[PDB]
Design a protein that fits this description.
The structure is cut from a larger assembly and holds one copy of chain A, one copy of chain B, two copies of chain C and two copies of chain E. Chain B has four helices and no strands. Chain B is mainly α. The chains are: A alpha+beta, B mainly alpha, C alpha+beta, E mainly beta. The structure holds magnesium ion (MG). Chain A binds one RNA strand through loops. Chain C: Keywords: Acetylation, ADP-ribosylation, DNA-directed RNA polymerase, Nucleotidyltransferase, Transcription, Transferase.
Chain lengths: 147, 83, 231, 232, 100, 50
Amino acid sequence: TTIKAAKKMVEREEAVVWDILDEVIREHPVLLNRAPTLHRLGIQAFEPVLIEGKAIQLHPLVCAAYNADFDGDQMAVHVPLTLEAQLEARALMMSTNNILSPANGEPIIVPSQDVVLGLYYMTRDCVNAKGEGMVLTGPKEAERLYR
Amino acid sequence: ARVTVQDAVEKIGNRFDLVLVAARRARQMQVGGKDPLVPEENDKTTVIALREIEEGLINNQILDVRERQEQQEQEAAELQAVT
Amino acid sequence: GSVTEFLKPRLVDIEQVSSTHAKVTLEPLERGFGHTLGNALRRILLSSMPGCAVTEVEIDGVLHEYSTKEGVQEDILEILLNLKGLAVRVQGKDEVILTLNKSGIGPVTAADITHDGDVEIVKPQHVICHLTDENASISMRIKVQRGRGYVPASTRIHSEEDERPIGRLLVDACYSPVERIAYNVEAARVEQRTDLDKLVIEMETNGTIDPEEAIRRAATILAEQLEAFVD
Amino acid sequence: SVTEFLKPRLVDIEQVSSTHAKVTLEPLERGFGHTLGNALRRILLSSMPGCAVTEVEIDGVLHEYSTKEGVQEDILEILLNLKGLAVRVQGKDEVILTLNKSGIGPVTAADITHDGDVEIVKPQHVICHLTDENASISMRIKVQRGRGYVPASTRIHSEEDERPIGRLLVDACYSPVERIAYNVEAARVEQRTDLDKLVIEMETNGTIDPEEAIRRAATILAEQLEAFVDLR
Amino acid sequence: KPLVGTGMERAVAVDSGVTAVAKRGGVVQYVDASRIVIKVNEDEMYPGEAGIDIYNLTKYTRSNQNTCINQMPCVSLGEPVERGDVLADGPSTDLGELAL
Amino acid sequence: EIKELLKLGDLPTSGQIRLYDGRTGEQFERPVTVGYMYMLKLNHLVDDKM
RNA sequence: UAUAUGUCAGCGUGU
Ligand SMILES: [Mg+2]
């Protein structure tokens, strides 16, 4: 009924508070920014997902854009307030909107370390392997046989 | 939900006034107590505004026309009440 | 609660993408239990699901797999591949033999197979081959057998030991009705515990049975296996 | 084929040691051995109920980061030693044991006062050392039955009357098992060759029997699968 | 202790003042978590001396970096000791070897 | 010398053993290098950085 | 939202 009651409830961390927090962050972008903001892609808007722990979870594919590695790097998060700021974050500064480097037009979303290795290992041929020379009806049969 | 705004961008065509139009529509819904032109799938005001912009139901000209119509009907109603 | 009390799913949601495609979501589950359930169900469905499938076939005028026939657009290998995808439901006995005879111009659908009371074809419009010459004819004897899981032709030819009768080409048998099964584990939150598991199972079958029926059969099989030590 | 599935049965249990144990499931159909072994290993290593030490109280000790006159081990070291204590409780589900010792010597688990229901699996588990003739130790140990790993930080959330100065919280690892391994081998039943036999080796703290653990894991698995049995 | 080391851990641990190094040889007359009393040998006894060396270990003392400095004894009651032998293990030390 | 010491115990001299996936129970397709490494905890704690 | 009272140096960490 009053601001003091809401403050007390959020301090006590009631069950309804978590549901309210889930409701308010459904489509509210947050701006993630690294300390050295060399170029435009140093700050990008992301949709938040509530997680446990104490560390911000970042998408691997954007790391090359941030020049960030998981060796102890830190990031700052900002919350847009007005509707205009949220719409600018969703339409202009969203991660999906930033796919080409403004410096030269080259793409910025490329697999770096483990995706490339996994795809290379999966897409390889051995001249004598298990189940060689057989004929399959489709990719689903291949997945079934491999599993 | 919404992941990209490319179709909305091409519907508007500039990506800068699209933000302004979506903000105006979101303010109309949130503050003016209007109703969405699309089914309300528990989405936020901005997402709903972008979604209804995508299929061409809302633009600058349409918003201006609706505002003019509302102003004219409110003026007619208040003139009738005065008389 | 109690040391013997465990969380059980209560958000069971079923989405029917197609008549043979389904997606089942179970939430919430105890931490780590989603992986156990998904892996067990996937293994049982992939390797230990009973069903009827084509085992071998003999075609007149064809001696080996590296052969050709006049009038058929599809090759012998492609004919065997098409026969692999045929789904047959048998309620009469373990082993049945059907005869397919046709002549003329056009496709040879599964509806042209000789009608049998026990044998039922879930896809009569399934295409086997194409006849391009009006004087050309196709006559084959398909053999269907009941088994479990996937049995490649290499194991069958290594264990046939019948001097390899001529004309009887072996074809891989897909006894299990499931055509593809995948499972993902996602994070789910109850009250303040955000570390719970939610299981998403995406399954496409060959049309013989519904994917929900396949899940029920796999669960029943696992329960019957475990009933000895259940108390 | 449809109803040819052979139901596995508990054939032989081999107790090579107090903690190490081996169980055998036979017969098992092709492919079912790996599935059953993996499911049992994953269930046993995570959801096995057991008793563990939760709270401690020493007369002359106010906090963990302190020392007692006449004991070689620190209070934190004493708590760490008590954390590894193995105790089995029958029905109480919550016990308060008392330990009293005096004189120079190693104070072990055998010095805990006798309680009818509780039982110490390892009486030789050393707790501390008294290095003075006049040194005397008196201790109250709270033992609770639970499941999984529950750190004391989560248990701090309970706020009824706070805690008196001197009650030390100990992280509880209720899991009795510590190592689970399984292997599938060829099984001989009548004249059938395509049969498997599963051997499960369990290393625990000795507070649970292998047969009881296997039965509990199977019951948990069946209860979980009952949701899939009726998909609705 | 480091399973794979270089052999310089002992020198680093001893040279630094973290550990308690016996000044004179003897036997551990009294051992405790907070203090050690060593009965020195008659060879090293000074004339007119009681003949006991008392080491008071620092227990949970704040360091310059807001860390814990704690010394734990590494000897038993009655165990003979010699000059230069470590009697207590300081922070990040295991039986006289550096343990980071 | 490392290989000789490994042979002294009942361990392979290659330094790589066969590992099984915990979640799925399937053996990894290639041997994986397992061993014991001395790891240190640096004075950069996340709870002190929030 | 306005709460109880923050400014300069030196040192250090990550890009
Ligand atoms: Mg870095």
